[PDB]
Ligand binder design. Sequence first.
Ligand SMILES: [Zn+2]
Length: 90
Amino acid sequence: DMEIAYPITCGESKAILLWKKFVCPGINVKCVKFNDQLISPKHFVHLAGKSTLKDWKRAIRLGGIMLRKMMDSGQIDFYQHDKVCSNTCR
Ligand SMILES: [Zn+2]
């Protein structure tokens, strides 16, 4: 079908989050398309220059809002988070 996704940013860098690939705990999961390469949020954040924050969920933004908040709202949280979790996402 279609690849559900969301446009995201980090610093002045733009990328695309493939939502169904966004699986807990997300940090090292290849779910971000950046320059036609599928990479992890940790790598995207590093390349965007925000690794010094030590909080990828706050470094990445969706519509200007910290990804952390969109995740906490339940509207854009990890795919199938209620059943698939590492217990280290918090
Ligand atoms: Zn989790």
